[PDB]
Copies of this chain bind each other. A is one copy, B any other.
Amino acid sequence: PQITLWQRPLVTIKIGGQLKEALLDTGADDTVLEEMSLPGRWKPKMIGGIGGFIKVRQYDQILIEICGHKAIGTVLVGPTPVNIIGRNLLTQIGCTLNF
């Protein structure tokens, strides 16, 4: 679809069987979701932006469905205030910025 930026670009995603709302964030290199249980081994990682860094757990090869589009990629899980879909997954769904 064509998403305007008058409002926050929130989309419904499906991961681990759970439906969540997430922000399409072109400035985010990675995808970070609020605390949740994901299967598999994970690696600790530190990601930061405005306000500083947070410790997250990195899960690789996670299948996510973004607005009906399946994508596979690394997902970070941690105390983020908002679920963020970063570039690692937006590329997979063929998302582009147009103007």
Contact = CB atoms under 8 A, between A and B. Distances in A.
Interface of A: 1-6, 8-9, 23-29, 32, 47-54, 67, 69, 80-82, 84, 87, 90-91, 93-99
Nearest to A48: B51
Given A28-B27, A29-B8, A2 B51 contact: no
A27 B84 contact: yes
Copies in the complex: 2
A36 B81 CA distance: 27
Given A27-B27, A50-B50, 16 more contacts: A1-B99, A3-B96, A4-B91, A5-B97, A6-B91, A8-B29, A8-B87, A25-B27, A48-B49, A48-B81, A49-B52, A49-B81, A50-B54, A51-B51, A67-B99, A93-B99
